[PDB]
Amino acid sequence: YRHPLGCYFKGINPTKVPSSGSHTILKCTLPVVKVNASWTLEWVVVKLQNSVDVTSYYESSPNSGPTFLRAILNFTPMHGLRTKNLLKVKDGFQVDNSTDNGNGGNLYVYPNATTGSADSVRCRLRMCPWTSNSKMTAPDEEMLRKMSEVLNLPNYGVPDLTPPRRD
Amino acid sequence: YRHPLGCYFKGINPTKVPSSGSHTILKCTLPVVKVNASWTLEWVVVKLQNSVDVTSYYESSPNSGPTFLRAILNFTPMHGLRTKNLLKVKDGFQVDNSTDNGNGGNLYVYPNATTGSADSVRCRLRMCPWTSNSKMTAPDEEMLRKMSEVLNLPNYGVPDLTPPRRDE
Ligand SMILES: *[C@@H]1O[C@H](CO)[C@@H](O[C@@H]2O[C@H](CO)[C@@H](O[C@H]3O[C@H](CO)[C@@H](O)[C@H](O)[C@@H]3O)[C@H](O)[C@H]2NC(C)=O)[C@H](O)[C@H]1NC(C)=O
Ligand SMILES: *[C@@H]1O[C@H](CO)[C@@H](O[C@@H]2O[C@H](CO)[C@@H](O[C@H]3O[C@H](CO)[C@@H](O)[C@H](O)[C@@H]3O)[C@H](O)[C@H]2NC(C)=O)[C@H](O)[C@H]1NC(C)=O
Ligand SMILES: *[C@@H]1O[C@H](CO)[C@@H](O[C@@H]2O[C@H](CO)[C@@H](O)[C@H](O)[C@H]2NC(C)=O)[C@H](O)[C@H]1NC(C)=O
Ligand SMILES: *[C@@H]1O[C@H](CO)[C@@H](O[C@@H]2O[C@H](CO)[C@@H](O)[C@H](O)[C@H]2NC(C)=O)[C@H](O)[C@H]1NC(C)=O
Ligand SMILES: *[C@@H]1O[C@H](CO)[C@@H](O[C@@H]2O[C@H](CO)[C@@H](O)[C@H](O)[C@H]2NC(C)=O)[C@H](O)[C@H]1NC(C)=O
Ligand SMILES: *[C@@H]1O[C@H](CO)[C@@H](O)[C@H](O)[C@H]1NC(C)=O
């Protein structure tokens, strides 16, 4: 099946996509890496010290780079801790879930959101490679070669607790 | 009997323990955390880009903070150096295996060691909590509250690739 190899927690600065409406469309350009992996980028609004309710989920293959699939719910936010509630459409933040239109999973920052939370947004990419090999415990040398662009990104919120290995 | 929850790789600066002896005694003050955990601090000698052959092993309970048990061998060193190359008693480095009375597991830096080695020493604490609950995959909120002092320590040698959790 798809045996996980680990997760990379990197930070990407969003790029403004010129829009037709009054809203701000933000895109976090993902490196075109052709390896078996899952890409979950969390939209962190630094100014409000909170995150958006849903995260953009992408998937990569050995013959295709990260391609958008769906906008899954944010289960483990960077801040959270029940001190505050995640930012929703009501708060002026929405991720489009369209696969037909060229957008997705780009963040929509409507004028309804705090002035100016859009410029404060930062991505927390959770790149998690996998392999068909059950005997592989970490990414091999040629896989780390292909993932160079992701590996060279700055670390963002990488946890202190290293999970235990299968015993 | 004791299910692991993970490991914290933190750095601690050693404190010089006064002694009327020619040797230097270094202590890495561990936070008094009352949780079920194992504490393995590695004595890294930064100047020589090497570590000491043995590590001080401590154990904590919900009724007692980290208490020293024994000086176990360094299996996974920092600089990736092969075992046998690690700084031994011959090189002027020794960890006290004494349970009674005190001064264990404190590092002894004898005068025959390279000048400036003692001041260069840094600890690599490997704090690994463990629960009796088989259905617990990560430390709970009240456990992370108690481990605040360890969590606020600076990271030291923790890898960039986070291994996958108990899933597949
Ligand atoms: C990248 O991930 C792919 C899964 O998303 C994976 O492809 C799958 O590989 C398996 C074999 O590992 C194929 O299944 C074949 O294996 C059985 C025995 O278990 C044979 O009897 C059959 O030939 C069977 O088809 C899947 O067909 C395949 N799935 C698809 C369509 O992708 C890749 O192997 C992964 N690549 C790397 C390099 O990690
Ligand atoms: C902290 O770790 C302890 C283990 O190092 C653990 O204590 C052990 O808990 C089990 C039950 O979960 C006890 O039960 C066993 O022994 C009794 C007789 O004493 C039998 O009746 C039981 O059937 C079973 O075999 C152990 O006695 C106990 N061991 C000791 C002495 O510590 C704690 O539960 C852990 N605490 C937390 C909060 O994580
Ligand atoms: C984004 O769109 C997909 C549809 O492609 C949604 O996925 C559905 O999820 C529900 C359960 O939550 C299932 O009942 C459906 O079968 C799924 N559809 C399929 C076939 O993929 C997804 O929930 C949407 N995300 C958002 C923004 O809520
Ligand atoms: C702030 O603005 C957005 C739109 O600019 C609002 O979102 C819409 O909410 C209505 C509720 O009736 C829904 O029908 C739409 O699906 C939402 N629009 C889209 C496509 O995003 C949001 O409710 C506003 N928040 C405030 C302050 O009321
Ligand atoms: C450096 O000095 C220490 C003592 O100051 C030496 O350690 C002793 O080595 C002998 C080997 O026969 C043993 O009896 C003991 O394990 C050591 N004594 C203690 C308790 O420290 C060490 O051998 C010296 N290294 C050099 C350069 O010869
Ligand atoms: C320290 O003492 C313990 C006693 O349990 C012993 O098992 C161990 O071999 C000693 N450590 C070393 C390697 O000197």
Strands B3-4 and B15-17: unpaired
Q: Which residue, B39, B37, B34, B51, is CA-closest to B9?
A: B39
Residue A21 buriedness (CB in 10 A; 0-12 / 13-18 / 19+): exposed
**Which of B151, B163, B167 has its CB closest to that of A162?**
B163
Of the candidates B7, B139, B164, the beta carbon closest to that of A4 is on B164
Q: Are B31 and B8 in contact (CB under 8 A)?
A: no
In A, minimum Cα distance to B11 occurs at A160
Ligand 3 in contact with A70 (CB < 6 A)? yes
Q: How far is the CA of B100 from the centre of ligand 6 (A)?
A: 14
d(CA A124, CA A105): 14
Domain B1-168: give its CATH code. Answer: 2.60.40.2900
Domain chopping of chain A, boundaries: 1-167
- Report helix, strand or coil for A104: coil
Q: What is the 3-state secondary structure (H, E, C) of chain B?
A: CCEECCEEEEEECCEEECCCCCCEEEECCCCCCCCCEEEEEEEEECCCCEEECEEEEEEEECCEEEEEEEEEECCCCCCCCCCCCCECHHHCEEECCCCCCCCCCCEEECCCCCCCCCCCEEEEEEEEEEECCCCCCCCCHHHHHHCHHHHCCCECCCCCCECCCCCC
CA–CA distance, B90 with B53 (Å, rounded to integer): 11
Q: Resolution of this PDB entry, in A? A: 3.0
Question: What's the one-letter identity of residue B159?
Answer: P
Residues of chain B contacting A9 with CB distance shorter than 8 Å: 162
Within 8 A by CB and 6+ apart from A152, the residues are none
What is the token pair recorded at A132?
A: 């068909």
Helix (H) or strand (E) segment spanning residue A107: strand A107-109
Question: Hey, what CATH class is A1-167 in?
Answer: mainly beta
H/E element holding A38? Answer: strand A37-45
Question: Residue B36: CB within 6 Å of ligand 2?
Answer: yes
Only one residue has tokens 């959770």, namely A126
Asked if residue A138 lies in contact with residue A131, where contact means CB atoms within 8 angstroms, the answer is no
Elucidation technique: X-ray
Contact by Cβ (8 Å): A16, A26:
yes
CA of B146, nearest ligand number: 2
C-alpha–C-alpha distance, residues A123 and A22, integer Å: 22
